[PDB]
Amino acid sequence: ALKALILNTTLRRSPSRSQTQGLIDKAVPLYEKEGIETEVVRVIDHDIEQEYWDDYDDWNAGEKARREDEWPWLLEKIREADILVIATPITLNMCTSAAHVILEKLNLMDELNGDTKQFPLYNKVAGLLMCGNEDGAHHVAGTVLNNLGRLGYSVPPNAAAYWLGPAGTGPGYIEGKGDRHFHTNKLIRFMVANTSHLARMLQETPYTTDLEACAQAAREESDDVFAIRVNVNTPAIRYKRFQKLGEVKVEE
Amino acid sequence: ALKALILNTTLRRSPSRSQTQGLIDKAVPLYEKEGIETEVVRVIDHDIEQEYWDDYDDWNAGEKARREDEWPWLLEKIREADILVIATPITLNMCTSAAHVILEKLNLMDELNGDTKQFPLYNKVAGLLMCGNEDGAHHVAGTVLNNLGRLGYSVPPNAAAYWLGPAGTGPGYIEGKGDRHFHTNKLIRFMVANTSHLARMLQETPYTTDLEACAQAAREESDDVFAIRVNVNTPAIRYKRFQKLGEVKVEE
Amino acid sequence: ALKALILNTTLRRSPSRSQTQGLIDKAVPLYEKEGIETEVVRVIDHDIEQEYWDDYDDWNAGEKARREDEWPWLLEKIREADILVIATPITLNMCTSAAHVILEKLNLMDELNGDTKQFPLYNKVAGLLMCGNEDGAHHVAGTVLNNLGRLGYSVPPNAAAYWLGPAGTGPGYIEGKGDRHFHTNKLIRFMVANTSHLARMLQETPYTTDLEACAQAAREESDDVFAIRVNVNTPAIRYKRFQKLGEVKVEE
Amino acid sequence: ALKALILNTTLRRSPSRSQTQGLIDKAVPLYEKEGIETEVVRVIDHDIEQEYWDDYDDWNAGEKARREDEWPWLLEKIREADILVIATPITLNMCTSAAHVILEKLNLMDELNGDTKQFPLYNKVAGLLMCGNEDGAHHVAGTVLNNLGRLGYSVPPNAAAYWLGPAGTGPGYIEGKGDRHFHTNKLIRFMVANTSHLARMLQETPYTTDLEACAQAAREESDDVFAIRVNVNTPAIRYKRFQKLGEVKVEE
């Protein structure tokens, strides 16, 4: 069967009560009625290393970045899930820092599958559940769904469901009675119905795009050097699409 | 046959040379090789009224807003196109004001159909071409594609292609030789292949979601009043998800 | 004698009731108690041409762009005001298209003050009023206030005041009783008090920065060509800060 | 003697070479030439706990969030610094998750200066250094500087300096020769000059705003309950500022 993986990216460790979890609790039985098996992971409960290392970095400095953690376990669940729902509180008009770490680490998956010539997360479907006290839902949805789009996820219409109160400091979903908020409840239902349909579609008729071939055709029509002259004689920062400075020619 | 409509939202009237049109000129033959009938509209060439009126406004003040313009023609083309590609320059880290006016008027389309019980632009596909001198493509992509998804568009992976120069004032795509810019050329090819595929899928197996039925289910599990107490005794704007202010008792 | 100019960027013509105008009506008497002269302009009531032309465009295509409108009148007012307050409704998680046009045209300035070597809007102060039915205030503040900062405006703390209802379709400020909304009313008071203080400060102690001399220091430490090699052999879009492609050597 | 604190929020531990540190290395001598004592902290080098606990959470599970870490050490520096410069690489069109955590924890302060009745970070100045491979500088600047403004920071004009390559995957500042990039080098000079000036101003003539008095005046003109009726009989998500549903009357 198809699988939906819902990542609660709250910053409070289980079992502390999460506002965002209220939206998850509505979505789970709806996915199960669709025949889509659900799993909820609260990512902050798990040891996921934030630090970065590759071979350009200092070798000893990277020991902590290279340590054994729980990321392979979580990455494998994401690879296996046909639907990825990020369920995030809003902080600083963004997703939480926990969602941010996960997405940073996930952005290793724009390289290739040997037989599809597609990124590893191609043919999957993304949805979004968000909870804020007042503001930021559409901004976060734009940022997060755009990034997932870059990785291979398809986004159906009305794929982001959320709760917000009025302009103010709070309170959140629980005291604000968001479990009976009509607009949120109808958005959650839209999102589940549409992500489920698109997931079944992509299971039957995946993209056949060969990104390697697209890239080769693009190589055969492009240069391998970008170069432009800069006007260094002005403090101005106003935009000029035509600057008439002269084109550049490259050494040998 | 499938139709793709590409809206160049440059602020300069034809035949003035448009940087963004360079990306369009790459995309059109690629769609035509996909078997998809393409049409390019430069919306600024057409008389589209920006002012708003509805029957809550003053009747005389709204006369200019109600005047006969070319919006019904353009709206009918959007309704007919299976793929909508917004092709916009970046201004102020946003789409152009012309794209903005078009999207404002298009967001009247969030009500139902017959028959399908879906918004009128359901089962369509969105992609994005963008051109800026230096910065803003992913921010604009998040904003524009999120809004199109609210209307019923589905978004495939890698649906946004763009050109940008380095940090600076420009110049633009033409002087910058973007027509031979590898990254842009490959993204344009990704976008055309993926949008064409998703359009063919949705032609054959559209969403069957009944938004009316989703809304009726939400109504049964929801209140028809939102009400919270407010802490009027503090200058603080720190978020507080629990405030223990007491419930609001509502009459009738 | 300081002047504050408040631009209501609603899309509905006077005298139609504007939701955003409710916040302006709170702010005006507060500024006047500060001893600051205030003027409110509803910009949609004035003829401001959106289209663009310069010498690189087609002459005949640009005739409409070059026509007589009310922009010189409005631009002179912005230039003269010590405090600019954009008072914008939210559309599509952005300011309105009317605000978008004004800012597009305001960004077309290409001057440097001969005596101070600064942009024309240096030493002015920016505040923000916003009104939306549910969502978008901090995103719009980020975008608009970042753009004004690039032009020369300084931004005090708590410079953006706004009203929003809960997640939903509305209603707006008037039916939602925003005029008695504590959070909005206290933010408006913070905004007026802080912008007023900062405006007075800059009137006594303006920036003495010499933008021309900064740019000349930068010219001495910088190249006049930007050039990089591009990896044209991969479909990957993964970010690689080091790519081992070789330096490009330019011939001048 | 003013203090400037520069937080490098790279995800790579010292002494691994950071692209963003290149911009920092330009700014530090410019600040010291202004007579400002400058400290650089690479926050990822320090053990700062990401998890959240307060007394509404689960005591037992909150033990890790409550643990002794290095946050008080870093917060003291932020409390003392007259200028805070966030120096962040761009990930996912945002600041890094490391910057995200720091700002999250900074936003948890709940204090009012007993004498000035201002938030604790009032009268400070914020600036920004950013480094990305291609895109996101103005979006990050909007988000980060809007958040610091809510905390009490003032933002001068041209307070955000950055480097970006063209559309693509990289490379970054070092291989792209950003240390000799004219646009970046001049923006760094603008930013140091303007933040230094504004910090000196605010040390002389701080804001005298009484936030508590402002909130008390807002309390007198406002309701202590927010309540609106909802239309539960539509699937539409079209925005409607006027819905004629009727007022909510609240008991007692």
Ligand SMILES: Cc1cc2nc3c(=O)[nH]c(=O)[nH]c3[n+](CC(=O)[C@@H](O)[C@@H](O)COP(=O)(O)O)c2cc1N
């Ligand atoms: C540091 C910080 C920043 C915030 N930025 C925003 C914002 O910018 N906008 C908003 O509307 N709300 C914001 N909130 C409230 C919020 O979202 C959470 O409390 C709630 O949702 C809890 O969910 P959870 O119980 O599942 O963890 C923030 C709270 C923070 N601690």
Ligand SMILES: Cc1cc2nc3c(=O)[nH]c(=O)[nH]c3[n+](CC(=O)[C@@H](O)[C@@H](O)COP(=O)(O)O)c2cc1N
């Ligand atoms: C007022 C204003 C603002 C801008 N804001 C940004 C921005 O924030 N970022 C960027 O990278 N570029 C920006 N540009 C350059 C740009 O985009 C166009 O010139 C080009 O693309 C034209 O394309 P076209 O020939 O098809 O019209 C702006 C230019 C403006 N006139």
Ligand SMILES: Cc1cc2nc3c(=O)[nH]c(=O)[nH]c3[n+](CC(=O)[C@@H](O)[C@@H](O)COP(=O)(O)O)c2cc1N
């Ligand atoms: C097309 C369109 C899009 C919108 N996008 C958003 C959004 O993204 N978020 C929101 O919260 N609200 C939004 N609204 C409501 C809104 O803002 C205005 O009606 C109000 O403010 C009127 O103010 P006024 O009477 O002074 O003109 C939109 C309304 C639109 N017509």
Ligand SMILES: Cc1cc2nc3c(=O)[nH]c(=O)[nH]c3[n+](CC(=O)[C@@H](O)[C@@H](O)COP(=O)(O)O)c2cc1N
């Ligand atoms: C996961 C991920 C995401 C990214 N998202 C973006 C983006 O959205 N836009 C951009 O322009 N660049 C991006 N980069 C490159 C970047 O910024 C850094 O490598 C550089 O700056 C290193 O700086 P440092 O050596 O001081 O750490 C990303 C890189 C990542 N590892």
